[PDB]
Amino acid sequence: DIVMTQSQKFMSTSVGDRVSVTCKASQNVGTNVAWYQQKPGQSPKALIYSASYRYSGVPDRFTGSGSGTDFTLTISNVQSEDLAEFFCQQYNNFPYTFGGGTQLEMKRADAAPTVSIFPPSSEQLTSGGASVVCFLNNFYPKDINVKWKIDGSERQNGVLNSWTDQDSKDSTYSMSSTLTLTKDEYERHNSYTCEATHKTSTSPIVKSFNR
């Protein structure tokens, strides 16, 4: 079969710059190459057919080029709204094969997270469980550390962390940290603290509550 090589899995850029995604086919496919864009949570969307022709509604900022084996998708004036994974594809020969995909990464000014802590809900406590949720929203860059403390004592077990994709509106990242205990253990303590360490501050950002 024909192997389509997207040598870069990630490409970083700033708003307004130009990016070029390369795609190399292991066999001559002429110009029967397509490009696709998959924004988070969405199905793939076709941008380019016949190596250089745009689908309806696709802006001229997306330019396809190449023939034979070497193919390139050029995005001019890249916007944070263009954040997606980009796939090349050949349809010259069965079976049709895709490239490995290239994820766009936006560089932006550093931003501190908006930290919010939430006590366990009344409903979950009436089930024997007790989860404490901490949201770390709209920060940059992605590298961040969360520390949970119970009555001033650090707690590392029972912590579930999750990170979102890069926000296509402001190029920021977000993270949720969930500390889960039993109901009896949760009522054994008073102070519940969520601390966030980020390059935007030498000191942590602290949010806490007393039950």
Binding site: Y36, S43, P44, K45, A46, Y49, Y53, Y55, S56, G57, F87, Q89, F94, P95, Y96, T97, F98, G99, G100, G101, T114, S116, F118, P120, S121, E123, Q124, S127, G129, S131, V133, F135, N137, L160, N161, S162, W163, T164, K169, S174, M175, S176, T178
Partner: protein
């Protein structure tokens, strides 16, 4: 033009399943219907294509013994049948067509197929109140779940699920100081596999 796909399917190992792609808004017998498989870390795979006019098919040989493409012209629906299912078949399956009048592509939402021996488990929904509000969706199986804020779209962060003790758990945060309370903020979350829909108002 619309391609309608079921949101999710949960099948046991060794069984079979049929995913439908219900089309509307155009002449069904005009365009090839393509099928694409997507799993994390594996990108996109082309399964094959079928022409509804005569059911002519081209298969990716990798999926020869696994996938079978059919159509029903009168109901303008295409189908894919998957046999001898294993966890390898757990993926999102898209149907797609190319319309030329100007070339435009149309895709289905994708069907999230989960091949597992675990039983369906509905999600327990918990409101998160202290303005940033939240919704905790814990202990559901399988993926996915669709959460919506009333509707609210800006200031919404729906985090990806994490598998904890064989169940999935995710959270959503809505950031709307005067709006809440007085403006009823409700967590809207659906689990298509358990056929379970829950509404939970965020109350102070």
């Amino acid at each position: 033009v619309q391609l309608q796909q079921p949101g999710a399917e949960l099948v046991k190992p060794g069984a079979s399943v049929t995913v439908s792609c219900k089309s509307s808004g155009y002449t069904f017998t005009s365009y090839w219907v393509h099928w694409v498989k997507q799993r994390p870390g594996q990108g996109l795979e082309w399964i094959g294509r079928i022409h509804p006019s005569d059911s002519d098919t081209n298969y990716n040989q990798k999926f020869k013994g696994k996938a079978t493409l059919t159509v029903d012209k009168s109901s303008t629906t295409a189908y894919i049948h998957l046999s001898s299912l294993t966890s390898e078949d757990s993926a999102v399956y898209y149907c797609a067509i190319e319309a030329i009048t100007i070339t435009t592509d149309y895709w289905g939402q994708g069907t999230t197929l989960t091949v597992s021996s675990a039983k369906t488990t509905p999600p327990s929904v918990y409101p998160l109140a202290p303005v940033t509000l939240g919704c905790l969706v814990k202990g559901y199986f399988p993926e996915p779940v669709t959460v919506t804020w009333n509707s609210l779209s800006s200031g919404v962060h729906t985090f990806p699920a994490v598998l904890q003790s064989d169940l999935y758990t995710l959270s959503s945060s809505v950031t709307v100081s005067s709006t809440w309370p007085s403006e009823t903020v409700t967590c809207n979350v659906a689990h298509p596999a358990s056929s379970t829909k829950v509404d939970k108002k965020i109350v102070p």
